[PDB]
Amino acid sequence: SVKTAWRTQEVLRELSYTQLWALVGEGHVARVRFYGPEKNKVMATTRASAPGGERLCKVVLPPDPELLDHLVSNGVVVDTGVTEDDRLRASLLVQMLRYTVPFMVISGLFWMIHTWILDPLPN
Amino acid sequence: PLTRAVLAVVRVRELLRALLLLPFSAVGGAVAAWQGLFNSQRYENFLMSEGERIWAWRNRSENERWFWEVFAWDRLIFPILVIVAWEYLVPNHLVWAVLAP
Amino acid sequence: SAIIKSINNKTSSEKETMQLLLMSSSILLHLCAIISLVSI
């Protein structure tokens, strides 16, 4: 039970494949995000009305072409882990990597000529 | 009247000539201010006080200095990373998991 | 573009960990190659 244990470090519960079905049927799953290198794992976030409140569950998906209609029929909101904001930061990083070489060579030249003449050893 | 009129013309054109170069002279004056701060006696006093502070701090931090210079990577993090990385690759044999390492 | 977008899309501050890991391992690959060559 929940009443006979210490609260410890919020983590992801695990549903098998079936209580996920019943839960998304009863209208309780609220949002779903797909992940996995082969796109067959689900992280599902429930809604407050469910028995147990909002939790974050994990499900493993074995190919089933009825899934999408079931989800979209019951008001579930699918999601992808990318916002224009994130892509726009990746673009910024690519541009920095583009510029890093010429700046590196001009810094190298400047420090060569600095060490060589305009600030040498004293004698 | 005429010569002071020519002087008035040179004065107005001097106004224009002074203003057209104002960003350049602005950066120049800012640079002059910057490099003026760093040859006083006040800056020398600061440098010497910082020297004393560094000396005091170095006499109290010998164990941590040796730890971060000689021990952190070479004898704590590198062998752990190496063993974990080797065991990540290298199939679940015995010659490869235990005997060759 | 495609490399970085793919490692963003697949796997909070986790994208930053993955990107730093990517850049670090690439530079280390090039350096190890050069040193091992020059060691003959």
């Binding site: 290198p37 | - | 490399i3 793919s6 490692i7 697949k10 796997t11 890991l21 391992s25 690439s26 690959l29």
Partner: peptide, 15 residues
């Protein structure tokens, strides 16, 4: 680079 290889193997179309 073997950690990211499942991720980077979508740029080729395989698993």
């Amino acid at each position: 680079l073997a950690l990211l290889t499942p991720t980077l193997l979508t740029l080729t179309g395989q698993s």
